[PDB]
């Protein structure tokens with residue numbers, strides 16, 4: 001449910017909430033109001049509030065005195081299932097026991113605060129189907145709200161929109177009778193499960209929130225102008241839905257696989273992980289790599305993976321070989337900020353190296369402005385005729401923190417990557433990696449998915465950036481990490497539409 005996240009609370013408001021409405025073990029998370037990528041975990045212990053910083057520069061959530069995580073929900077899940085594991089600077093244990101729930105509705109897909117009654121009928125008439133709903137602030141009754149629902153068959157009167165008035169009396173919400181709820185979310189959840197019935201029998205089913213993020217490609221410029229004037233709010237609504245994505249990650253947690261993960265708690269989902277076959281028969285667990293298949297849904301596929309560790313380079317090449325991948329995208333330098341982000345896993349130019357049962361030749365490197373292309377030949381040792389060329393596109397100019405201030409470089413790169421993949425008959429998924437394999441990796445993959453829709457169907461197709469992101473996030477944890485990456489995706493799509501109108 002992720003109610004412990006408070007999107008619009010101050011540091012002082014957070015202390016007071018925990019001191020007046022919480023107990024020892026109560027906690028909440030909140031953003032830093034002028035520092036995107038900064039979050040705070042506020043926790044009560046010993047009748048006093050402690051504040052722990054979480055930093056995200058684009059690769060992972062880094063909890064001070066704790067671990068690195070793919071999502072705040074995964075971070076809270078981990079500490080609510082492990083006593084004694086979160087520690088103060090001096091080393092005392094901080095326990096997260098009791099989430100302190102937020103009543104703020106602003107990050108709910110169905111909450112459209114500023115929106116009139118006829119404005120809500122238009123949207124539902126056009127964009128909505130049976131069971132589509134939204135909640136808006138009342139115009140005629142200050143402080144109250146309205147629930148607008150479409151029901152019918154999918155202009156002949158077969159459909160209709162019903163309005164239901166939501167009273168706010170003494171910080172509780174009701175539909176005119178029955179139960180009084182502490183938040184609009186509690187109210188909506190209750191009638192989502194126990195639908196209202198009109199006397200004459202219509203069931204006001206709340207099946208899905210009204211979709212307002214799906215846009216036609218030719219109107220990208222206007223939506224971006226609107227989000228610029230916010231990108232923040234839309235992003236936060238997306239992050240709220242990450243509690244629905246806590247799929248199991250058991251294989252990455254096995255003792256045998258511990259040291260195959262760059263970060264112990266950033267792990268591939270079981271249901272999409274790449275399973276490696278034909279492993280050394282002596283090796284107990286030989287089927288594991290920290291990598292997931294990303295299959296775009298609603299025909300190129302990807303594998304999103306971490307930067308190699310020295311002990312997983314053999315597994316990486318087993319995976320490229322097994323999957324028939326012919327194109328690799330590397331999203332970081334080898335070293336950034338003096339720290340190793342992905343080990344060198346390819347031979348020096350003109351050299352040949354064996355990586356366990358795999359053999360790799362570096363045929364030729366070519367320097368471009370923003371990237372290096374390495375033409376590699378991959379084959380299985382002892383088996384001459386298994387040789388294939390693998391083209392490695394190494395993007396070298398992404399800044400150490402944040403995102404590029406212009407998307408042309410990335411877009412020129414993806415264009416060239418796309419033409420290479422398309423030129424090779426029956427090529428397998430495009431491998432995209434480095435660092436933890438969720439931030440830049442997920443950003444490059446999302447842009448690539450969106451740009452391919454526009455390249456095939458033109459500027460007469462519909463795109464939905466957050467839906468696309470949620471679909472990739474259901475296949476690997478935390479794909480697209482920051483609000484800066486989120487804005488960068490919109491800017492890249494826009495830029496790609498502006499140069500297609502230049503043709």
Ligand SMILES: NCCCc1cnc2c(-c3cccc(Cl)c3Cl)c[nH]c2c1
Nearest residue numbers: 106108109111234237238241466467470
């Ligand atoms: N309270 C803001 C209401 C406007 C709104 C609606 N919808 C989304 C979405 C979204 C869209 C499709 C699917 C999913 Cl799962 C999401 Cl989160 C992400 N930001 C949004 C913002």
